[PDB]
């Protein structure tokens, strides 16, 4: 499972980099300048980071070791959080400006996306400096393997966890969930606007709905299924992989299908 989803995430980051190179290869020489290419390529790099955050999720004591563990936990946290922020804040900025200018200048877009990313990074950093992540082991009930070797096995399972999780994690999940619901609401409200300065607000609306649905599904399931490593890992990995694949395609393949006549 680990190597299969890692191959999938690698192909995902390859496609994301190819697509960002394409979109910047036609930066302003065509109508692409209408649909803000900076927001789109910020979304692409956010999806690339979120897909790259799949490898630290699968690395445990089978590969790394005890002393190299707090680096894997930190890679998990920072890659996943910053990737989600950079890949959702751009779409939310696009849709929020499309909403509020119809109920403008391209520097307010960057100002507010920087504000969102800064807020996410500041809160994640303050959480990580207050109660840092560290290795913790949780044990199961004893069992008896009957290979006639006459020994009792005490199955253990280790996972990155702070001192008091399910509280800070709960706050992050709730804040991101309210942001995602606002994204869905604003995307639904402004599906009829036909602004010419911003070309693809309907595509970012569809991608926002998809990402929000998949994230709101896989956020509590991973907390419930925590004591099963394969279930939780497969759920998080497939959520990331599918959300990134679909947002990349629905956000970019119409551009390269219209440009190629």
């Amino acid at each position: 499972l680990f190597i299969s989803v890692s191959v999938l995430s690698s192909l995902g980051i390859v496609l994301a980099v190819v697509c960002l190179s394409f979109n910047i290869y036609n930066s302003h020489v065509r109508y692409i300048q209408n649909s803000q290419p900076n927001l789109n390529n910020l979304t692409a790099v956010g999806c690339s980071l979120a897909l790259a955050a799949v490898f630290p999720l699968g690395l445990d004591g089978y590969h790394i070791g005890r002393n190299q563990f707090p680096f894997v936990c930190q890679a998990r946290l920072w890659l996943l959080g910053l990737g989600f922020s950079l890949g959702y804040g751009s779409m939310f900025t696009k849709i929020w400006w499309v909403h509020t200018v119809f109920t403008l200048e391209p520097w307010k877009l960057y100002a507010t996306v920087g504000l969102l990313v800064g807020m996410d990074v500041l809160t994640l950093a303050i959480w990580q400096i207050v109660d840092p992540l560290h290795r913790t082991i949780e044990t199961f009930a004893k069992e008896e393997p009957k290979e006639d070797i006459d020994v009792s096995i005490l199955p253990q399972l280790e996972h990155c966890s702070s001192r008091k999780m399910n509280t800070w994690l709960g706050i992050f999940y709730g804040y991101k969930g309210l942001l995602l619901l606002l994204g869905i609401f604003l995307a639904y409200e402004t599906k009829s606007v036909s602004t010419e300065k911003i070309n693809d607000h309907r595509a970012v609306g569809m991608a926002i709905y998809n990402v929000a649905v998949l994230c709101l599904i896989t956020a509590p399931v991973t907390m419930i299924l925590s004591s099963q490593q394969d279930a939780a890992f497969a759920f998080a990995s497939l959520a990331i992989v599918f959300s990134s694949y679909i947002t990349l395609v629905v956000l970019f393949v119409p551009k390269m299908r219209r440009l190629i006549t």
Partner: protein, 131 residues
Amino acid sequence: VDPLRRTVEKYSMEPDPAGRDISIRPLLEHCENTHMTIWLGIVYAYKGLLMLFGCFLAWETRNVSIPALNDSKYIGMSVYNVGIMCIIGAAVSFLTRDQPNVQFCIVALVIIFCSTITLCLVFVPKLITLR
């Protein structure tokens, strides 16, 4: 072939009450058979096949563009929500067998959400114009 009989499992004899001197052994009633996965898989295969043909034919009729019966957007959205939520529910219910409350809450919310969406997205767009 497989009448899907009733089976009961037991585990964890040692749990104790508030001090009433009993070894409360908890057991749980289930409904399995010999090969549950094969039958459930062929059922989901048939349902997904009809879902896929419906989505295909709904995409093929995308460009009719009459303000009265186009409605392919609603077909797409409803089948997307139903597919994803039923797949997640069928994956989660099997992984939480030893938790009856969580299993029941998951499957009940899945059914409620899918049915209410596939009903609203078909009936509320009509009754919003008739006002």
